[PDB]
Ligand binder design. Structure first.
Ligand SMILES: [Zn+2]
Ligand SMILES: [Zn+2]
Ligand SMILES: [Zn+2]
Ligand SMILES: [Zn+2]
Lengths: 264, 264, 264, 264
């Protein structure tokens, strides 16, 4: 009776479907896949990448950056929503090939440093190549690259270091407040009485109100389905997108229903 | 005109005055100096150390542990209030000579990993040898060593990873709730409008209420003067010690007065 | 055309076949699987573990240690041959559950810190949970635990930080020089003109002579087949075991033949 | 009798005397102090910095880079001779303000990661702010930035990760082979029978022959006095500079004389 073999982290085929760079605003572009968000912000002093998706997406991300006229050495900063393999996967490889830095809070830094291993809920089942954080950001700290200011908003829940990023871009000169909020789900999490996360419910409830008050004109999520985005239709991608109130209120209803059946 | 020389972190002579192990409870001992707290908890499965003081105190700590019949390999865990040089100093040296592990939250871990350098308020002026954290603890997580359970209580303010530790010991069988709360001061900190700590005031106010509600029968602080402890008098050390309400209420008055004159 | 899914590191079923602790000397025991070596050294002051095998072997290792009367807190030190997933796999999990420290050289430390990712020859195909090294050892440095001295012998080749460990045990009082040498193979390695390892051939040739001169009465390897060990037969396990000269001379013949056909 | 206070790492005033950028070749510039070498290499795709000097030199280095028309974001890579405070000091601060990466071998990486603490010969007396390595280089590995190729040459002795860097620049089109070799001294080192460095003598002897065979037309050292450089005289700085043979042969005579009197 041999010990069980290792099992790889497999996802849906739509999570790995490459797409051409879809434009969100004057300086914001989606360069990930159909069901994984990878935001690129082109500035006058360099590019900024928010999340990266699965670890095997490092090559696809570099191709879309070259399509936007962005050399590897032009990527200046990598920002993360939360350090899971399906979002912070190719961060290690992108640091070696682009010369970019990674800015994340302490909780995301320690999770990214160990490659998602020893997860509070998943253990070692979802492990990705480890990467180090070059700058530790605090709640509400502003990060500026090429004149565009990125403000961090801590929303602990899915991970202790979940962060929503807000910045103001333009749409043919007319400004737009973009808010890239993280996930608010808890797939298979032990919500009540978790020894690894005793204050989990208090963090989710405080994060639901944090998402509601985010300065936002266009909402984006790491998984586009959470905010009712459809990258496949291109022009009509942001047609039925949800607000910050609708996204937080819908996630709280699922949280309370999951918390209620957990006690059953 | 040569560049200025480096300056060492010098403290008062009382902070470096060795003392014999002063007993606090049946299993708790003070093995630091007169003005620096180093709590040792002897259990049936090993010893636990809370803080260590200045970096040059590693030799004095090992001597007092040997006086208590504790070999270096018997030290099982090191706990920290906050990762500053005057408390988490000899942590790196103690890990090499005792085989103990360090448990701290993410904010204390990233601060301990870089040896206090790049401080949010002090910069590189107070640098100590770096040490790594072996276990990342969350708010309210319980750590048990030899039957004694240590509960973490996050109180961000002095540092983002300030932690108060509470545990129940005995006094000749009669139990006692000990609460080792961290400092609540802000020496020379920019309280309002700090770009490195935008939510500093919100963290201090929330930490003041956290200290008030701590389960406590005997309060101890990293600096014994903050809780009106006097290690020099030995038997009368805990005579005029402050409560949790008195300690938090007195620190908030100084915080508001400092915040008021800062706006002046 | 979706991007290819991730693939897990699968091995032979014999590499994951648990076995009872097989005795090697008075204080040395094999507690791994049939085709993976995990040496345990019981001393008067604690236990020492050399390698651990696949990452999913952490539970099996703790069971055999309990069979030998070794509690988790009794494991004092973990030693490694080279930081690959099939040997240094459960190191991260064993550190969290045993309170042991890890001693390895700089090259093994930086490879263990990133969980085998960014391998010089394998890339990210063989990734395991990352672990940190607590003590950096040099070539020829002696490590003593409970009176038994372990001497490190650098043999760079399979990995830049491959290390052979030698120590003197007994066999009913009669001493025996045990040498736990690392692998000398190069599976699919680019030997000549490797940009990631320009001095690869010089390191292998210098390592072949290092293995020949190792003080050895009984040779063991991470893979027992390399030294002609057969853990399955129990008593006759060390019957046809190879010497240090035979093991190094046979590995060099395969190295030269592989280097010759590589130029073809 | 209080414990002794901490003492800062003080150096000569000439080690902290700022100087204007002195030109070495068409693309190589000295931007450090009079007695500390800080080489800057301006390419078409960015700048490369070799060493930095004392930790308090980060501001002076950025000023000279601005004089050479090099913005902070233009610094692409930082190379190190050995990770001591008087050479790798401002590396941590330069990474935060320039967005550059650090390339060093495993031994320099683990020494830079702990800020020079726990030195093999100095202990914790010479501690500097810690910095992380982004790329691990091997012996003879080539690093190219903007067409200029930097080849690493391991020369363990002063530190286990001492590295000499060689590259070919020009002098008005006429090429010149520059070799930036590390120090070969051992100030107060225990050469024979050192438990922290058992193979110290073998590494020094092998490093002396390594420096002799370095491809070199102009030699530079971290301390300009070792190679008979005089940055103060400007034009006549490289007048009486030593060769690679003269520098290695003079250092070996001092090594043997120091090794001889150590046995006395
Ligand atoms: Zn997800
Ligand atoms: Zn203090
Ligand atoms: Zn193997
Ligand atoms: Zn020097």
């Amino acid at each position: 009776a041999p010990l069980p073999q290792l099992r790889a982290y497999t996802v849906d085929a739509s999570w790995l479907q490459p797409m051409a760079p879809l434009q969100v605003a004057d300086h914001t572009w989606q360069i990930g896949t159909e069901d994984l968000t990878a935001l690129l912000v082109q500035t006058a002093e360099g590019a900024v990448l928010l999340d990266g998706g699965m670890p095997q997406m490092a090559g696809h991300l570099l191709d879309n950056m070259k399509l936007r006229g962005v050399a590897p050495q032009d990527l200046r900063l990598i920002l993360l929503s939360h350090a899971h393999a399906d979002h912070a996967g190719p961060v290690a490889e992108l640091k070696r090939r682009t010369g970019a830095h990674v800015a994340a809070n302490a909780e995301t830094a320690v999770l990214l440093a160990r490659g998602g291993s020893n997860d509070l809920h998943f253990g070692d089942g979802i492990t990705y190549p480890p990467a180090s954080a070059d700058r530790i950001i605090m709640d509400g700290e502003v990060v500026t690259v090429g004149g565009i200011a990125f403000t961090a908003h801590f929303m602990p829940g899915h991970t202790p270091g979940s962060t929503a990023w807000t910045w103001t871009d333009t749409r043919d000169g007319k400004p737009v407040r973009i808010a890239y909020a993280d996930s608010l789900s808890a797939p298979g999490y032990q919500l009540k009485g978790n020894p690894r996360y005793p204050r989990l419910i208090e963090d989710y409830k405080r994060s639901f109100a944090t998402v509601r008050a985010l300065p936002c004109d266009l909402l984006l999520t790491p998984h586009p389905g959470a905010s009712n985005w459809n990258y496949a239709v291109g022009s009509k991608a942001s047609a039925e997108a949800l607000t910050c109130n609708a996204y937080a209120d819908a996630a709280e209803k699922k949280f309370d229903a999951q918390l209620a059946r957990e006690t059953a």
